[PDB]
Amino acid sequence: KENICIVFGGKEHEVSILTAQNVLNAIDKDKYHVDIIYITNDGDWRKQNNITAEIKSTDELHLENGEALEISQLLKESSSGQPYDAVFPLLHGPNGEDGTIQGLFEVLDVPYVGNGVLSAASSMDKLVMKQLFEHRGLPQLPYISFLRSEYEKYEHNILKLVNDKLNYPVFVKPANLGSSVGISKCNNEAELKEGIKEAFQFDRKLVIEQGVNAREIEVAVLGNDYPEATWPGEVVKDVAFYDYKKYKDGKVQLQIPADLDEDVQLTLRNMALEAFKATDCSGLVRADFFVTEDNQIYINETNAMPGFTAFSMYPKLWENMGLSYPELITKLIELAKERHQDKQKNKYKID
Amino acid sequence: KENICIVFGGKEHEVSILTAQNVLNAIDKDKYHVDIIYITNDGDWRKQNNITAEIKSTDELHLENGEALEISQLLKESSSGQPYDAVFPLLHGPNGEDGTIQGLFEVLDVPYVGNGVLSAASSMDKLVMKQLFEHRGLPQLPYISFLRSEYEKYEHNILKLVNDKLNYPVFVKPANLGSSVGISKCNNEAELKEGIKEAFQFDRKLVIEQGVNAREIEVAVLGNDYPEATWPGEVVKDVAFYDYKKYKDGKVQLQIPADLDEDVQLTLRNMALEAFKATDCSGLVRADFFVTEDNQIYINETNAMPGFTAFSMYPKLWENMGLSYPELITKLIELAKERHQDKQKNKYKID
């Protein structure tokens, strides 16, 4: 058996916990020895050893009453007594996909699924992500950015650059948040200024982005050095608007593949690979696009740890390619093994 | 008293250990309670509690025989029984300035000196660093970059782009190393190809850089949101060459301020601040420039944790401004406190 540890929760949990239930029930307990570590909202790490049956309800998860050892000892050793072959972060904290847990994993020399430090961190900062996309030549909506320090001195002058380079309406976006906290849509300077002031309560760096009305199209990418991209998918919505949040009850309504011309789909698959390379991803990414009704394409953002329930977009895009959810989980673990092995080979060849 | 922890060593140590001796002997043991954690080449963490006298020889450091508790307990609590007010990483491992230890620090919610995760990681990847410098408008030598995957398919085609955009000689540079391992200077394709092949043994991503002969000029930057830059300094060298390494015995020979026109110095101070902002630095950075004999300026790289002995360039640049080495250490701790406090204020205002 191989030795796996799923880390879930994070310093709101209900998605992460549902995800960890799905990932657990889709792992062959015959091929894998599975421990899990739950991170409480407090930040405390609680381990639960040796999952061996299906998790039918969240009650079966020890959660905050798990075994409360130091984080060092929790990750060094499987309950089986072997070191882990892969650790799978399914976190919904900021420490989830800002590169921080990945940094911990590297310091502890623990092999792990998904994106590395620089990749996760730069996909979480919206300014760095766009700067990397730009250098790579991917099309994006016209955009501006600045630090609070610059706006305190150049308010009047920054607003002019907005009206020259962009067309209203624009969106004010905090650079470093994982949440819709502080985003607003502004139809003029008056609203823009109010919006900028309003976002600086939550962040020190802002992106101003030209608005579009467009379809949201997502592509799943999987791999390390030779990644592959799925056919695109769509969350079907008769009306494009920024909701600020999923309000409709029940399952989300996916269309996979998306109802797009076959040429446009191929363009999006190739753009997804470019977006993966532009932030030097590992393991996986979801590329999220804006596609207007006249088939104009912009890349919106990448997502370094995308939604990963059994009905989420990222796994359902791979199902459409023939890759089962249990096969996808196993592939992510093998990629984690390979990236990890490739680093001692380099750390060795450095002598 | 405030509570400080110096982390030094790292998974070669002699500079880091000399540095930790200097930083220790320059801290007022009356104002600060000082513990230190030593990271062995093995990666093991060993704590030594409550430094209270001058460290006259490295023998007085417990080093690898320090107290061998789990890393979690080592950082959570000062020997005094209080949580730390600041942790000061003085590491010479890759885990030093690739953002990994900083990620650990954030996961453990430990306040810490210097650059954050994204800042350290992006200053260590030479491709991302140049891409950020470019977007900011700082002048750099003409350069190319590619992944191993791209060169395996486009060898012939990538070499042409080199000869069109650059002028020989060029330097082949691994993107992700902190070491001179795999750098070479090439006067033609024949050498370039050999050089590219030679660097791929140690890295998966490369930068090809146009060579210059120039003076090396360094500027020290200190601050968080309102940073300040020193007058520039110079390691004086009658002959510009890439040494691959300091060979001369004894002290390095600094000229502070550098023998440059007063206008050129002011330009470099302002470029240093731009370079700090371009990678969203915190705490400090050293901006390293190429300045030709005809006063043409290029930024070479930033250094997120620069040399920090008492005779290193970064502290000596601040001494020239009137800031003593003990005052600089204290300023770095206050900045660590401020960045840390500013994050709960935001994490609070996010509700």
Numbering used by the authors:
A (entry chain A), B (entry chain A): 3 to 13, 16 to 249, 251 to 356
Study text:
To gain further insight into the mechanism of acetate inhibition, the X-ray crystal structure of a Ddl/acetate complex was obtained using co-crystals of Ddl and acetate. One acetate is positioned within the adenine binding subsite of the ATP binding site and the other acetate ion is positioned in the second d-Ala binding site. Also, the methyl group of acetate forms van der Waals interactions with the side chain of Leu145. The acetate ion that binds to the d-Ala binding site forms a bidentate polar interaction with the side chain of Arg291 and a hydrogen-bonded interaction with the backbone nitrogen of Gly312. These two residues are conserved in Ddl homologs and previous structural data clearly illustrate the crucial role these residues play in d-Ala binding. Interestingly, this loop is well ordered in the acetate-bound structure described here, which gives the first view of the S. aureus Ddl ω loop and the interactions it may form with substrates or inhibitors. The ω loop is shifted towards the ATP binding site and repositions the conserved Tyr246 side chain within the ATP binding site, which likely hinders the binding of ATP.
Ddl has two d-Ala binding sites and one ATP-binding site, and DSF experiments were conducted with various combinations of these ligands.
